[PDB]
Amino acid sequence: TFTNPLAEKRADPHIFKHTDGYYYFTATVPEYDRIVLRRATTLQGLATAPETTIWTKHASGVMGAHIWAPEIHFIDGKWYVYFAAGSTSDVWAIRMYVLESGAANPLTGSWTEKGQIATPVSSFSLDATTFVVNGVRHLAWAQRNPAEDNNTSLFIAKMANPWTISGTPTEISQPTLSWETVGYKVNEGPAVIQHGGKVFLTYSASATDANYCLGMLSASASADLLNAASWTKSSQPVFKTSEATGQYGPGHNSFTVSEDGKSDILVYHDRNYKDISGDPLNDPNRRTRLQKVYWNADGTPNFGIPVADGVTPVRFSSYNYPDRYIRHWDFRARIEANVTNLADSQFRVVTGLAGSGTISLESANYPGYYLRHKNYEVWVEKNDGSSAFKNDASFSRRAGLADSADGIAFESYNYPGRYLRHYENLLRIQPVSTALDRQDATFYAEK
Ligand SMILES: OC[C@@H]1O[C@@H](OC[C@@H]2O[C@@H](O)[C@H](O)[C@H]2O)[C@H](O)[C@H]1O
Ligand SMILES: OC[C@@H]1O[C@@H](O)[C@H](O)[C@H]1O
Ligand SMILES: OC[C@@H]1O[C@@H](O)[C@H](O)[C@H]1O
Ligand SMILES: [Cl-]
Ligand code: NA
C-alpha cells in the first residue's frame, strides 16, 4: 500500500527503478527553473528522500525557461534525462532536450548536454519519453503539427541513439474528442506500459486544471508502431477527476513497478481541490501520487479512479472462489469475478467506527460509505453519524477461519459469533459452524 500524496508541489512525476536497488524520482518543480532528483530503496521511501538539483536553467538563450517534465532513464550503461525548455528570448519556443551522465550515482554525477532532439518540423515540442518494444527503442512525444488548429499531438519514432531519432516520425493521435479539447486542444505526456504482448500508450489531454485526464492508445507488441493503423484510441478517458474522492485533473503519468517487480504502479499528479485562482500554469499545487494498476481479464489495464488521500485501498478475494472479489452493485455487497468497475471492489481498512480496536471497511469510490450490515445482509452505505451505523460497520479482524496464517475473517462487533460470509455470492453476517462455512467466511487482502 501507498500513502498519498508521495510529494507535494511536484508535477509530471517520473519514477525509474534501477538495477542498483534504488528508485529514482524526478518531476517538474513550480518555478520551472531546474531538474531535481531523489532516490530511495522503496517507493514509499521516496516521500522523505532528499532532493538534489542536478541541472539548472541557462542564464540566457535556449534551455533558459519553462524547464518542464523531466524523465530519467538508464540506457546502454549511461543515464539520460529527457526534458523540455523554452528560451530566455522566447519562453514559449519549447523544444526537447537530453542530458547524459556516465556516473554510477546520477545524484552526484556530472551531466553533459546532448542538445535538442531534432525533428523534421520546427514547432512546440515536449514530454519526450523512451521505451523498447520487440527489441526496438522508440521515442514518443508531444508536438504541434502546424497544419492542425490545436496545441500538441502525439508522435512516435525509432531512435539512432538516446538523443537522436532515426527515420521519420508518425503522428499517432491528435486532440479531437470533447474531453481532449477543454480549454486547449491537447494530447501530451505520452507514457508506455506493456503487458501480455500488448502495448498501451497513455497520454494526458485538455488543460491542466480539473479537466486534465488520461486517454489511451492500444497496440499489439508485434505490430509496426510507426503505422498509425496499429493504434486504437480509447473513446473515453481511462483516468479522470473523481469529485467523490476529491481528486481533480489527474494526469501526466508514468509507470513503475513494486518492490518485487510483480505489480505495475501508476505514477501521476493531481490537485485536491477543483477551482484554481488565475492561470493554472501559475498554480503550484499539483502533487505526485501512486496507485497499483490492476489488469483486466481481457488484458487491458484498469486504472480505476484516483483514490482518496491517505492509505490506498485494497481488494478482498474469496478463499474458496479465488477470482471473486467483494464488490458492491446497487449498493448491495457480493463476491464477483472480473469486476469491470474496479473501484466497486476496493475498500480501505480504517480504525473501527465503534472503537475498542475494531476495524471498518470504507468504500474507495464512495468515501464515507462503509460495508455495514442490516437484517444480517451486507450493503455499502453512507455513515450518518448514528451510533447504530458505527456498530453495524465495525468488525473484529480475525485470522482466517479456513487459513489462519494468510487469511482474514471479519467478526461482527454487535453480533459476536456472526462473520462476514458469502452465500449464493451475496454477503451476509452469519454464524460459522461447518468446514464450508469457515471457507465462506475467509478472504484475502491483496492476493
Ligand atoms: O453499488 C452502487 C453502484 O451501482 C452500480 O451501478 C448501478 C447501475 O447504474 C445504472 O446504469 C443501472 O440501472 C444500475 O444497475 C455501480 O457499479 C456501483 O458503483
Ligand atoms: O504545459 C501544457 C501546455 O500549456 C498550455 O498551453 C496547454 O495546456 C499545453 O499545451
Ligand atoms: O457464495 C457461493 C456459495 O453459495 C453457497 O451455496 C455456499 O455457501 C457459497 O460458497
Ligand atoms: Cl462490473
Ligand atoms: Na512523461
UniProtKB/Swiss-Prot annotation:
Pfam families: AbfB, Glyco_hydro_43. GO terms for molecular function: alpha-L-arabinofuranosidase activity. GO terms for cellular component: extracellular region. Substrate binds at residues 151, 252, 286, 328-331, 344, 422-425, 440. It comes from Streptomyces avermitilis (strain ATCC 31267 / DSM 46492 / JCM 5070 / NBRC 14893 / NCIMB 12804 / NRRL 8165 / MA-4680). Optimum temperature is 45 degrees Celsius. Its main location: secreted. Changing residue 188 to A: Abolishes catalytic activity. Organized into two domains: an N-terminal catalytic domain and a C-terminal arabinose-binding domain (ABD). The record marks 127 as: Important for catalytic activity, responsible for pKa modulation of the active site Glu and correct orientation of both the proton donor and substrate. It catalyses: Hydrolysis of terminal non-reducing alpha-L-arabinofuranoside residues in alpha-L-arabinosides. Keywords: Carbohydrate metabolism, Glycosidase, Hydrolase, Secreted, Signal. Residues 314-444 are annotated as: ABD. InterPro entries: AbfB_ABD (IPR007934), AbfB_ABD_sf (IPR036195), Glyco_hydro_43 (IPR006710), Glyco_hydro_beta-prop_sf (IPR023296). Its EC number is 3.2.1.55. Belongs to the glycosyl hydrolase 43 family. This is Extracellular exo-alpha-(1->5)-L-arabinofuranosidase. The gene is Araf43A. One of its GO terms (biological process) is arabinan catabolic process. It is an enzyme of class 3 (hydrolase). It is found in: Secreted.
